[PDB]
Design a protein around this ligand. Structure first.
Ligand SMILES: [Cl-]
Ligand SMILES: [Zn+2]
Ligand SMILES: [Zn+2]
Ligand SMILES: [Zn+2]
Ligand SMILES: [Zn+2]
Lengths: 141, 149
């Protein structure tokens, strides 16, 4: 499965709940619609796309408006202005000891460059990634 | 580079979700994942007995669990000890994947330079590397500047 999405969803559900907006089916469609697309939305266009694709949601423009606002304040979305898209914050990678749970955070520039080469080579624009290494530390063996 | 640092262990999260009961069933799976050893049903019992007496997992629950966590695939049983079969979590090698977040197109890959770098990173920090996960996310050449397809 797409791990990036599950992390985005968890984080979305958390922002809603913390901000005291309900987590509903309408909001989940809304997050999916922003994740799976490559274009920027106004509240008006995001509402139309959702209304058009899932008519039985009875999505209203106010939920869309208020969610976008909550997401912007949480830095989950960026705004070009109106016009929004999910933020892609750069991040590091992790190595996890299977025994004691010690974690090493790292970023290896040679690996980062190869990932961009793999993407270029198959015509992908590279947008995100996840890397974890699992092992046993020196102390645990 | 290395950095001072809440992170989820994805291969574990997945293992647990595949396993899907009780607090006893959980401690067993956790014991197998967190140990750098091959257990017999007996050694596994004694280990949970040393560490979680209060939960009293019977030897029957141990055999039953291992059997069930076997006629699935989740554990491998190759080799013997005096006390019985030795068991290991299945740890198959795998390739890496790039996924288009629009059309779901999946490209499988394995780049030897990255795999050797991962070996170096483990070595530099004194770790023995036993597994890894690498997913790349992006927009394939067919999904540029488009909505959910
Ligand atoms: Cl007790
Ligand atoms: Zn990375
Ligand atoms: Zn350790
Ligand atoms: Zn790999
Ligand atoms: Zn695509």
């Amino acid at each position: 499965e797409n791990v990036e999405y599950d992390v985005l969803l968890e984080r979305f559900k958390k922002i809603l709940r913390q901000g005291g907006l309900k987590y509903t089916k309408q909001r989940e469609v809304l997050l999916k619609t922003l994740y799976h697309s490559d274009t920027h939305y106004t509240p008006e266009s995001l509402y139309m796309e959702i209304k058009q694709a899932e008519p039985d949601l009875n999505v209203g423009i106010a939920t869309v408006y208020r969610t976008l606002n909550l997401l912007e304040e949480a830095e989950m979305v960026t705004s070009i202005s109106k016009k929004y898209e999910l933020a892609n914050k750069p991040h590091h990678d992790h190595m996890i000891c299977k025994n004691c749970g010690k974690i090493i955070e790292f970023e290896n520039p040679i690996i980062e460059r190869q990932q961009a080469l793999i993407a270029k080579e198959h015509g992908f624009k590279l947008t995100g990634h996840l890397m974890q290494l699992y092992g046993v530390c020196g102390d645990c063996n």
